[PDB]
Design a protein around this nucleic acid. Structure first.
Lengths: 56, 55
DNA sequence: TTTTGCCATGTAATTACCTAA
DNA sequence: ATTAGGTAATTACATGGCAAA
């Protein structure tokens, strides 16, 4: 899949969600997908990477 | 779906007894020796590990 | 017994998500 | 973003077995 760039609103909402729970459940991912206008896979990958930076 | 031969399952079981986790190399050796693809071996080990957890 | 018919089961393979690189 | 290997949960099959006329 192509490399994308998140808008400031997308990044803000993504950051507030990760603040509550670093893990996404399926329904939750689907919801953030239609609400933000982002492919579920991009949201899934964003959470993986954010968790990886936190550990380091 | 492939069904392993008597001597294959035998070698697989013995290998699994000495080490339940494969290294890329061991996996290659078993492949060329048993005439199986590396994927059939990887999945055999994954499943063996899973079957063991239930008992 | 013989024969016919259904189904429990062991198991290879697939799928989704994870970490770590 | 991609990649490999792991776990856990399913699925799809080849079988052997048991039931019963």
């Amino acid at each position: 899949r192509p490399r994308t760039a998140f808008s400031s609103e997308q990044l803000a909402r993504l950051k507030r969600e990760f603040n509550e729970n670093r893990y996404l459940t399926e329904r939750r991912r689907q919801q953030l997908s239609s609400e933000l206008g982002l492919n579920e896979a991009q949201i899934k990958i964003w959470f993986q990477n954010k968790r990886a930076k936190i550990k380091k």
